[PDB]
Symmetry: C2
């Protein structure tokens, strides 16, 4: 429902890490979904979560001189109601 | 997203109360929402929450010989995703 996080950049890069930074509105998301994969084809994308109050994450364990595609999703816990089950009852005694 | 609680009955009725009873799968819900109102008209519907492990609730302080419309909803917790924001970054060092 709510619009995606914005402004995905790195604040730090090393030979085996990417320190992600992003923005999102206050109290908007319960978590962030982070998906990263080598921009080539060395398998499948890895998924991680981060608390929704956080705006940075140290992606570690990476290969040197390698381009990664990084996707961030805001995760929203929605509290939904089922289709109502309804009935009429009459209290005892005289109206 | 998912189908509903079931079998809404009263287990007990007095001149100013309705003891509600229902069924639901164990741990299917975290809470139930109960809405009730006089079936004619005397204001607005009242809402209350009850823990999701309960299958019974006493509606209190009602009027005698009066029909009430009762609705019960299970509260479901859903995880939603936004559209992704994607970017490419290159790690430091050389690309062996």
């Amino acid at each position: 429902m709510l619009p995606a996080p914005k402004n995905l950049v790195v604040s730090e890069v090393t030979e085996d890490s990417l320190r992600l930074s992003w923005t999102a509105p206050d109290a908007a998301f319960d978590s962030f979904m982070i998906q990263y994969q080598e921009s080539e084809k060395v398998g499948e994308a890895i998924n991680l979560t981060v608390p929704g109050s956080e705006r940075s994450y140290d992606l570690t364990g990476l290969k040197p001189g390698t381009e990664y595609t990084v996707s961030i999703y805001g995760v929203l816990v929605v509290h939904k109601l089922t289709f109502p089950l309804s009935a009429e009852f009459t209290t005892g005694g005289h109206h």
